[PDB]
Design a protein around this ligand. Structure first.
Ligand code: FAD
Ligand code: FAD
Lengths: 472, 481
């Protein structure tokens, strides 16, 4: 009863499910193994999709319940939250998209095996199903796309009841009166903002001195934090958590101290969200028996074709180095299978954008000011505020700015940083610009439609190239 | 002094005198000053910013934004997200106030920018009175002479009148009256299903009006819209409740004793006479270049048959120090088009090269769903004999659109059959207006469909549908559809 395959993909997240589809489209007989009940991995089931749904719904709740809609002549007597219904909208979107992947596998002739995959030979994967039955796949190539898991906080046990990971935080059954978030990175600020909008008293505690995670430009990060604080989101930066105690009355006492030492205090909350990071997941995959060693951070080392040291066994996505993002994993999956078919394999991590889907949004691609300074690059700066952009002003939504970093000698765009309305979509024009090696002048001379937020991207590039914008 | 209004009548000298302060003129004036020219801008109206800021793009987009949110709240959308409201009521006065506040802030912004850049603002009616002379006539009857090396005509456009139907901005309105109606009309008829008419019709439809647009041609959305896009757009608007009578001519309109208006219509080719009644009639059959009392005849600058000023690739008229840009010359009558022409024109005066590729100028319709396009339509490629291939991706398969439950429409990419060069991009759906600028950048470089497919578009974003449609055009198949 074995299956024969050309390519066997272990995991169905952004990296694995896309790699499987593309491999089949290139003519490979393709199998995808997934241990969970649905396809789509972390992103679809407990990640990007449910978080963005709650961000959208909670933003609209805020617009209706607060001052915004009234200022536009949209008058409502009472605005009430129905959290069960809001969570239902989230779940409906997840179900539709997970079913969509199942259909795409059928359309492209990808064979779906439900079980826990273990590599049992250089050319063999064995999937064990929940009832113990096994399915053997004899296969020319193996693609490891096993993804990531939450990084635990030493001494604090997540139970998804009162101490939750992002998974528990996405499905709380009531708005907590008080919530503490450990970690002010992208995930923590997004989920904190959701619950703050819905009525919770929210504080994020962070060991470092800025919000938004690794690689965010410092000026952008400081201005972003100030805007979030005015919304009501509180922060304790430069602060260490030493422990948390689950109490008999169901609450949580969190012990904190200054990151540099001293200033010990205890803060109490109803829900504690632990979101200090994520890490590669390779458990019980068979790597030790094959001799595939991990790097000190748990990633699988791979070459430029994504081959492990065993050259017909590959790895992509959150299980290898680089930014732990869905579009990064997807592109690695595509190029890996194109390489298996003999083609070129290229991804430029400097051209991979990052987005924070708060309101205002934050998005960036390329290098920050801090990175350019460390590399000794001589650069110039152009800035344009959304308060001077016609679409933002017409919409009465004017927080933030576009900041462009350009090379002095050549006018090359080195980095683009956006805080404000539409940042998440706008960064993709910037990603194209970086991929093409655009100059600041090039972008300034695009005939951006009027009135659009994109005009602020043009104006910031004009300031960097010529020295002055038109409208500021 | 940087403001020369009534009572300020001493002769001025200038390097560049710009007539008009719309998107083309005010941007040209700022850029000219930044390039080192002593610059004057003459404007006859009480505020700066022209048609776009005062009675055009800005007030229309404000009402489109606000009426969309009214629809989300009053209809099914917010309830589907768990946002429960007892009553949702329209306060039209407050909605119009938000619009007016935005316009006032932006018009004041231009005044500040002129001051910051040392542009001299002359408030008056400019007339060219010699090859190097403009005379401004002010509200008090005073005159002021400007001796100037170069003249830049940026006098813009006006509404095209409809013979026999008198716009009074009461019950028979232009776009200006339609932007300031004092109550939601029970029934509205729109003459003209171009961009302006469809936008303003949709505003009032969302706010409660029964709206019908009557159009002589066979499609909605104006010149150059791709026909497949136009047909799919019309069907979506019809499902929203916006009615259309295409291939139909208006023969007249009568204001009646009960205060309503009877509009007489017929098939464009003849016959099928009918009368439709409305409370408000919006006349929006087009706009046309405005050059009244500018002095062109005395200078010998003749107009083309449509009223435009002929210019060369440097925007020079037949008199080589007199230039013209924007809605007063040929090309798409759009704000960003006028702005770009103004910038490159004054850069040329300063000695630079002058080049604009109109195939890279985008068009946007700010309905919901939005429509946006740049480059060539299928009809254009067929008429030019260009061999092309098609890639399409529906927003129903995009993760951001589906998560937001906002899934109308598609991205359509046209690529050259042999070379994979992007020839045109057409977007119907959420976020089209911002997304089309990624396409405009690609066209500036002569990028291929493959080039775009390989950009690492963020997940989840609407832009991924643009990537997927390019992948379908290049490789033959997308990932997610
Ligand atoms: C709350 C949250 C929000 C996020 N938001 C965003 C966002 O907005 N944008 C963004 O770009 N990224 C976001 N991310 C990150 C994104 O989810 C990941 O970068 C992405 O999912 C990684 O894809 P992957 O295919 O490499 O792995 P995963 O998505 O982790 O998929 C791995 C899959 O393999 C399965 N698996 C593992 N081992 C085996 C085995 N032995 N046998 C069978 N199956 C196995 C797992 O069950 C899983 O389905 C978010 C993450 C979280 C937690
Ligand atoms: C309802 C509506 C909505 C629109 N929406 C959009 C949109 O979303 N996007 C878009 O790109 N375009 C849009 N447009 C079109 C846009 O407004 C025009 O394309 C643009 O304003 C043209 O700019 P301009 O500088 O050439 O002329 P104008 O904006 O018309 O400005 C000309 C100026 O010159 C002044 N003037 C004229 N003659 C003289 C004189 N002799 N002396 C002194 N001053 C003089 C006028 O008073 C006026 O202020 C819209 C138009 C309308 C009517």
């Amino acid at each position: 009863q074995p299956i024969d395959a050309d390519v066997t993909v272990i995991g169905s997240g952004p990296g694995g499910y896309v790699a499987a589809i593309k491999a089949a489209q290139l003519g490979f007989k393709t199998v995808c193994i997934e241990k969970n009940e649905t396809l789509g991995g972390t992103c679809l089931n407990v990640g990007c999709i449910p978080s963005k749904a709650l961000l959208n719904n909670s933003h609209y709740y805020h617009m209706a319940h607060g001052k915004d809609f009234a200022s536009r002549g949209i008058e409502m007597s009472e605005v009430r939250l129905n959290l069960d219904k809001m969570m239902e909208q989230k779940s409906t979107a997840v179900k539709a998209l997970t079913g969509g992947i199942a259909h795409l596998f059928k359309q492209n002739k990808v064979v779906h095996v439900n079980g826990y995959g273990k590599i049992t030979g250089k050319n063999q994967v064995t999937a064990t199903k929940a009832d113990g039955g096994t399915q053997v796949i004899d296969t020319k190539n193996i693609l490891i796309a096993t993804g990531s898991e939450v990084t635990p906080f030493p001494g604090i046990t997540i139970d998804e009841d009162t101490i939750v990971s992002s998974t528990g935080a996405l499905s709380l059954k009531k708005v907590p009166e008080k919530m503490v978030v450990i970690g002010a990175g992208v995930i923590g600020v997004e989920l904190g903002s959701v619950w703050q909008r819905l009525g919770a008293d929210v504080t994020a505690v962070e060991f470092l001195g800025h919000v938004g995670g690794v690689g965010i430009d410092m000026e952008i990060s400081k201005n972003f934090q100030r805007i979030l604080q005015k919304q009501g989101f509180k922060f304790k930066l430069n602060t260490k958590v030493t422990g948390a105690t689950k109490k008999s009355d169901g609450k949580i006492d969190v012990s904190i101290e200054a990151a540099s030492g001293g200033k010990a205090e205890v803060i109490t909350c109803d829900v504690l969200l632990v979101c200090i990071g994520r890490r590669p997941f390779t458990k019980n995959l068979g790597l030790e028996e094959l001799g595939i060693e991990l790097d000190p951070r748990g990633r699988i080392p791979v070459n430029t074709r994504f081959q492990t040291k065993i050259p017909n066994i590959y790895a992509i996505g959150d299980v290898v180095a680089g930014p732990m993002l869905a579009h990064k994993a997807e592109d690695e999956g595509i190029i890996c299978v194109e390489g298996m078919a003999g083609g070129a394999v290229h991804i430029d991590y400097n051209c991979v954008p990052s987005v924070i889907y708060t309101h205002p949004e934050v998005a960036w691609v390329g290098k920050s000011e801090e990175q350019l300074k460390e590399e000794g690059i001589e650069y110039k700066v152009g800035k344009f505020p959304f308060a001077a952009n016609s679409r933002a002003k017409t919409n009465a939504d004017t927080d933030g700015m576009v900041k462009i970093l350009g090379q002095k000698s050549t006018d090359r765009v080195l980095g683009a940083h956006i805080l404000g309305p539409g940042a998440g979509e706008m960064v993709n024009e910037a990603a194209l610009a970086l991929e093409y090696g655009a100059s600041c002048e090039d972008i300034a001379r695009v005939c951006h439609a009027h009135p659009t937020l994109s005009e602020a991207f043009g104006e910031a590039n004009l300031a960097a190239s010529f020295g002055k914008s038109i409208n500021f």
